[PDB]
Amino acid sequence: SNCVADYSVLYNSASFSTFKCYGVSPTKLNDLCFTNVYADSFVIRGDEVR
Amino acid sequence: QIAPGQTGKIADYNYKLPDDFTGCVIAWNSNNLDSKVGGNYNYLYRLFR
Amino acid sequence: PYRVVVLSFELLHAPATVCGPKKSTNLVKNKCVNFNFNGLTGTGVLTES
Amino acid sequence: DVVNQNAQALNTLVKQLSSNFGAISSVLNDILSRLDPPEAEVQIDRLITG
């Protein structure tokens, strides 16, 4: 909460293999404003990413 | 990222596809020809724009 | 191993505090302008309520 | 009765703008923001048909 989500920073040191967005188009993420943002993180095997 | 309606450094600053595209995108791994033991620095990409 | 982060949110129904890198402009009233209030786009005339 | 029926018909025509018609939202602004053209066209077409 209370921060600008400028994801251009991740371009230098991140390489994501699977990026899927549901309910929103990935090209519209630069114009929107999100409420009640939560980040869930965990580690699984390669076959259960799907 | 080579697909209509995608984000990322490639689709934003390097190569963008139109939303109405007729055609096929074909890709295959080339690690046996485009990789060197010390590294291959001949391939470039645009990171800032 | 693969690290997975899932990001959840709602859109255009409740007050938001994150927003994007878009830069805001001045408020022009009593005129027909395109507006972008917290991601909600549209056209109309803005008046005091 | 004539004026009542005509007024009711116009009022219900106005009120039927709140129907999703199978789309994710009933407002074109909310469809056009957070959806890019290629997948917002489907929702817009549903609303147009309704």
Side-chain angles (χ1 to χ4, degrees):
Chain A
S1 43
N2 295 68
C3 59
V4 53
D6 183 74
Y7 64 109
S8 325
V9 153
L10 280 139
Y11 288 174
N12 291 317
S13 66
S15 42
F16 303 139
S17 177
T18 43
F19 177 80
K20 296 179 179 179
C21 289
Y22 313 90
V24 67
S25 290
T27 44
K28 311 289 296 184
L29 261 53
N30 245 347
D31 297 331
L32 270 149
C33 200
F34 320 92
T35 176
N36 256 359
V37 154
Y38 285 107
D40 317 337
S41 43
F42 50 90
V43 160
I44 39 184
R45 198 190 305 178
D47 316 342
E48 293 112 349
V49 183
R50 64 172 176 82
Chain B
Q1 295 188 28
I2 314 298
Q6 291 273 30
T7 167
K9 72 163 163 68
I10 291 304
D12 266 11
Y13 310 149
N14 298 274
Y15 185 77
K16 184 132 181 73
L17 273 193
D19 311 348
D20 37 17
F21 183 51
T22 293
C24 304
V25 286
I26 303 177
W28 68 100
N29 167 24
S30 176
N31 193 37
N32 58 350
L33 293 137
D34 298 293
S35 64
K36 259 169 29 54
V37 191
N40 203 335
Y41 302 96
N42 294 318
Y43 293 109
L44 295 145
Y45 67 99
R46 175 80 53 65
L47 182 55
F48 298 104
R49 207 178 177 273
Chain C
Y2 277 69
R3 303 185 159 192
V4 181
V5 197
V6 182
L7 311 184
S8 41
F9 43 74
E10 268 106 345
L11 286 175
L12 299 174
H13 287 293
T17 53
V18 165
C19 274
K22 186 68 68 65
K23 343 257 192 185
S24 72
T25 88
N26 310 11
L27 200 31
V28 292
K29 295 184 252 187
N30 317 313
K31 270 165 55 22
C32 197
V33 317
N34 307 273
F35 59 88
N36 193 320
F37 281 94
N38 278 30
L40 180 78
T41 80
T43 70
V45 180
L46 314 165
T47 53
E48 192 294 343
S49 300
Chain D
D1 275 322
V2 172
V3 301
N4 285 358
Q5 295 221 70
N6 293 147
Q8 184 173 40
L10 277 190
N11 292 337
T12 189
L13 195 56
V14 171
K15 184 172 321 312
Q16 284 178 352
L17 279 174
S18 66
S19 304
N20 298 345
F21 300 112
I24 72 199
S25 168
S26 85
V27 277
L28 282 180
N29 297 334
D30 181 21
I31 294 176
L32 285 165
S33 52
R34 85 201 180 61
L35 286 164
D36 58 3
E39 67 192 2
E41 180 186 326
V42 184
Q43 323 290 307
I44 295 185
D45 277 25
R46 282 193 200 142
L47 281 193
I48 284 181
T49 308

